[PDB]
Write an enzyme that holds these catalytic residues in place. Structure first.
Site, PDB file in Angstrom:
ATOM      1  N   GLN A  12       5.571  31.074 -37.832  1.00  0.00           N
ATOM      2  CA  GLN A  12       6.589  30.186 -37.287  1.00  0.00           C
ATOM      3  C   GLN A  12       7.804  30.938 -36.760  1.00  0.00           C
ATOM      4  O   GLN A  12       8.115  32.026 -37.234  1.00  0.00           O
ATOM      5  CB  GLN A  12       7.030  29.184 -38.365  1.00  0.00           C
ATOM      6  N   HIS A  37       3.911  30.988 -42.026  1.00  0.00           N
ATOM      7  CA  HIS A  37       4.027  29.602 -42.451  1.00  0.00           C
ATOM      8  C   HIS A  37       2.939  29.494 -43.517  1.00  0.00           C
ATOM      9  O   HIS A  37       3.204  29.118 -44.656  1.00  0.00           O
ATOM     10  CB  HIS A  37       3.756  28.628 -41.305  1.00  0.00           C
ATOM     11  N   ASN A  74      11.185  30.943 -47.114  1.00  0.00           N
ATOM     12  CA  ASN A  74      11.255  29.515 -46.873  1.00  0.00           C
ATOM     13  C   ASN A  74      12.466  29.462 -45.936  1.00  0.00           C
ATOM     14  O   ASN A  74      13.591  29.726 -46.369  1.00  0.00           O
ATOM     15  CB  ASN A  74      11.564  28.762 -48.166  1.00  0.00           C
ATOM     16  N   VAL A  75      12.246  29.155 -44.659  1.00  0.00           N
ATOM     17  CA  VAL A  75      13.354  29.131 -43.707  1.00  0.00           C
ATOM     18  C   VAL A  75      14.211  27.875 -43.792  1.00  0.00           C
ATOM     19  O   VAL A  75      15.372  27.880 -43.379  1.00  0.00           O
ATOM     20  CB  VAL A  75      12.857  29.282 -42.239  1.00  0.00           C
ATOM     21  N   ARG A  77      14.764  25.936 -46.797  1.00  0.00           N
ATOM     22  CA  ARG A  77      15.499  25.864 -48.054  1.00  0.00           C
ATOM     23  C   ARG A  77      15.468  27.210 -48.761  1.00  0.00           C
ATOM     24  O   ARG A  77      14.557  28.009 -48.551  1.00  0.00           O
ATOM     25  CB  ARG A  77      14.870  24.805 -48.963  1.00  0.00           C
ATOM     26  N   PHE A  83       7.819  27.060 -51.497  1.00  0.00           N
ATOM     27  CA  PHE A  83       7.082  27.087 -50.238  1.00  0.00           C
ATOM     28  C   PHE A  83       5.704  27.724 -50.441  1.00  0.00           C
ATOM     29  O   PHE A  83       4.694  27.182 -49.993  1.00  0.00           O
ATOM     30  CB  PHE A  83       7.905  27.854 -49.192  1.00  0.00           C
ATOM     31  N   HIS A  86       3.469  25.379 -52.401  1.00  0.00           N
ATOM     32  CA  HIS A  86       2.972  24.284 -51.583  1.00  0.00           C
ATOM     33  C   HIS A  86       1.825  24.720 -50.671  1.00  0.00           C
ATOM     34  O   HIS A  86       0.810  24.023 -50.553  1.00  0.00           O
ATOM     35  CB  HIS A  86       4.101  23.695 -50.734  1.00  0.00           C
ATOM     36  N   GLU A  87       1.982  25.872 -50.026  1.00  0.00           N
ATOM     37  CA  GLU A  87       0.950  26.355 -49.117  1.00  0.00           C
ATOM     38  C   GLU A  87      -0.338  26.681 -49.865  1.00  0.00           C
ATOM     39  O   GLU A  87      -1.435  26.459 -49.350  1.00  0.00           O
ATOM     40  CB  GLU A  87       1.453  27.573 -48.336  1.00  0.00           C
ATOM     41  N   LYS A  90      -1.885  23.136 -51.026  1.00  0.00           N
ATOM     42  CA  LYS A  90      -2.389  22.371 -49.899  1.00  0.00           C
ATOM     43  C   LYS A  90      -3.467  23.075 -49.077  1.00  0.00           C
ATOM     44  O   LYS A  90      -4.419  22.439 -48.624  1.00  0.00           O
ATOM     45  CB  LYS A  90      -1.224  21.980 -48.983  1.00  0.00           C
ATOM     46  N   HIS A  91      -3.333  24.384 -48.896  1.00  0.00           N
ATOM     47  CA  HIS A  91      -4.273  25.133 -48.068  1.00  0.00           C
ATOM     48  C   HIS A  91      -5.131  26.180 -48.784  1.00  0.00           C
ATOM     49  O   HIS A  91      -6.358  26.178 -48.655  1.00  0.00           O
ATOM     50  CB  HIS A  91      -3.498  25.806 -46.926  1.00  0.00           C
TER      51      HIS A  91
HETATM   52  O1  U5P Z   1       9.868  27.609 -43.772  1.00  0.00           O
HETATM   53  C1  U5P Z   1       9.340  26.543 -44.008  1.00  0.00           C
HETATM   54  C2  U5P Z   1       8.464  25.781 -43.149  1.00  0.00           C
HETATM   55  C3  U5P Z   1       7.961  24.619 -43.556  1.00  0.00           C
HETATM   56  N1  U5P Z   1       8.241  24.068 -44.815  1.00  0.00           N
HETATM   57  C4  U5P Z   1       7.687  22.766 -45.274  1.00  0.00           C
HETATM   58  O2  U5P Z   1       6.278  22.751 -45.406  1.00  0.00           O
HETATM   59  C5  U5P Z   1       5.706  21.546 -44.803  1.00  0.00           C
HETATM   60  C6  U5P Z   1       4.893  22.032 -43.599  1.00  0.00           C
HETATM   61  O3  U5P Z   1       3.726  22.814 -43.940  1.00  0.00           O
HETATM   62  P1  U5P Z   1       2.253  22.153 -44.093  1.00  0.00           P
HETATM   63  O4  U5P Z   1       2.237  21.132 -45.168  1.00  0.00           O
HETATM   64  O5  U5P Z   1       1.664  21.432 -42.913  1.00  0.00           O
HETATM   65  O6  U5P Z   1       1.383  23.432 -44.666  1.00  0.00           O
HETATM   66  C7  U5P Z   1       6.867  20.580 -44.572  1.00  0.00           C
HETATM   67  O7  U5P Z   1       7.078  19.581 -45.615  1.00  0.00           O
HETATM   68  C8  U5P Z   1       8.066  21.539 -44.450  1.00  0.00           C
HETATM   69  O8  U5P Z   1       9.326  20.959 -44.843  1.00  0.00           O
HETATM   70  C9  U5P Z   1       9.086  24.749 -45.711  1.00  0.00           C
HETATM   71  O9  U5P Z   1       9.336  24.273 -46.816  1.00  0.00           O
HETATM   72  N2  U5P Z   1       9.586  25.946 -45.255  1.00  0.00           N
END
Ligand code: U5P
Length: 193
Positions: A12, A37, A74-75, A77, A83, A86-87, A90-91
């Site tokens: 990103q 990302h 995390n750009v 927050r 971050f 979450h990745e 989810k992935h």
């Molecule tokens: O630097 C970043 C870029 C994206 N997101 C978050 O991750 C999600 C997008 O990624 P994805 O769920 O499609 O993998 C969104 O909720 C977005 O706010 C972050 O927290 N930090």
């Protein structure tokens, strides 16, 4: 169960991503380089998500935190771990049958070090300058450097309708090492970068 057949290594552009968050502060606003990302397993043209995998464990990648804080911040927050977690959930869980958490994050870091977008565009002065760029041109420069076509992703400002490049995707085969052509772009023929 599903077996991923390829990967989308998504990078990103911090400035653009931050601009779409007109509500609050953005830690990565000053970054002028593409950052990670995430690494998204794909299946028949679609991203596989939320697979029944292991919980994210920061200690499993403690040795990479150094590189991650620089290449995968995390750009939006000031919480990088949130971050990464979450990745992974989810992935990453969707390719865990072959790559455990440590292997997946290491893969992402290695891919990033082998895919310097800004460095690849500079010889052509095709880097960011806030002006209009050609999708064909940018994809062309990246393919000439890396060998395969990347995927370009854009976001449109709801107010002005102007399209901005926000992410660049590098596609890989199921082995997570062989670069292959990306075929889907969300960007139109022209966009701001
Ligand atoms: O630097 C970043 C870029 C994206 N997101 C978050 O991750 C999600 C997008 O990624 P994805 O769920 O499609 O993998 C969104 O909720 C977005 O706010 C972050 O927290 N930090």
């Amino acid at each position: 169960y599903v077996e991923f057949d390829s990967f989308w290594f998504v990078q990103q552009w911090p400035p653009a991503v931050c601009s779409f968050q007109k509500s609050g502060s953005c830690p990565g606003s000053g970054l002028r380089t593409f950052t990670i990302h995430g690494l998204w397993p794909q299946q028949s043209g679609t991203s596989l998500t939320n697979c029944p995998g292991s919980p994210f464990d920061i200690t499993k990648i403690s040795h990479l935190q150094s590189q991650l804080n620089t290449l995968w911040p995390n750009v939006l927050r000031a919480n990088n771990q949130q971050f990464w977690s979450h990745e992974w959930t989810k992935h990453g869980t969707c390719s865990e049958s072959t790559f455990n958490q440590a292997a997946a994050f290491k893969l992402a870091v290695d891919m990033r070090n082998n895919y310097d977008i800004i460095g690849a565009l500079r010889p052509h002065a095709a880097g960011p300058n806030g002006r209009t760029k050609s999708r064909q041109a940018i994809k062309g420069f990246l393919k000439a450097k890396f060998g395969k076509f990347p995927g370009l992703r854009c976001r449109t400002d709801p107010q002005t309708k102007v399209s901005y490049l926000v992410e660049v995707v590098a596609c890989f085969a199921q082995d997570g090492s062989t670069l292959i052509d990306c075929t889907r772009d969300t960007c139109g023929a022209n966009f701001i970068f």
